[PDB]
Design a protein around this nucleic acid. Sequence first.
RNA 1: UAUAUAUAUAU
RNA 2: UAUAUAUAUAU
Lengths: 121, 121
Amino acid sequence: KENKKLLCRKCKALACYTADVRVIEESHYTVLGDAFKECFVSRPHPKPKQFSSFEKRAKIFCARQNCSHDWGIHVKYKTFEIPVIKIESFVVEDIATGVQTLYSKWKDFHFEKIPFDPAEM
Amino acid sequence: KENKKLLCRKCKALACYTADVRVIEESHYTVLGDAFKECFVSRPHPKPKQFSSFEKRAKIFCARQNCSHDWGIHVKYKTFEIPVIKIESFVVEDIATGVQTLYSKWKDFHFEKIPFDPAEM
RNA sequence: UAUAUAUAUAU
RNA sequence: UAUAUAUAUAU
Ligand SMILES: [Zn+2]
Ligand SMILES: [Zn+2]
């Protein structure tokens, strides 16, 4: 459907665009592009676990100064070291109207969800 | 809508019927009749509190022999003494089919909601 | 991602 | 009844 903006729920900075979001194993969400990389910062995870093919390695936060909002975690998937975000950490903004939407769960967010793909990478 | 049975989620005993349920201030639920009063027991509330029109005085549980499953509270609303239940403690069973539903919030339970009325009482 | 327990705040 | 924080279980 419509491409939208994901903003940091705390400082409202543009984190990324739904178009760059990919779905892993139908329930986890990752973001593509070197752009989102300059948008978050990591920190070793207090209790790194391994469920299915992920290995919870660190935690991620908004890179902005006085913000540092918790955005989820960073993991090791297939051969990939990628981030995994929670929508509860951003504000979705319709680019046309400016209307903002607060989701707590990725299930309620009905955008065109695109499967993750190694090939892209 | 359909008149249904309310069973104790724990021991599955019959607590009441939706016909006898009355909604208060549009978000609080009580049950009418003496019959239901015989289905539960109460204990003076540990943390009694007063809120817009109620005065939380006690906690009510399933009176059934070896269950005593927490069912909600018992309050002083206006000049009355009525029990306030949470659907979370019950199993809604459809009488005609026997089908059962587990609600966590009354907002999701869609039956015919008769507003509490002093004239009845 | 989800399940469960626990206090704390509001009417 | 609604919100917020906190630990444990699961993949
Ligand atoms: Zn931020
Ligand atoms: Zn019971």
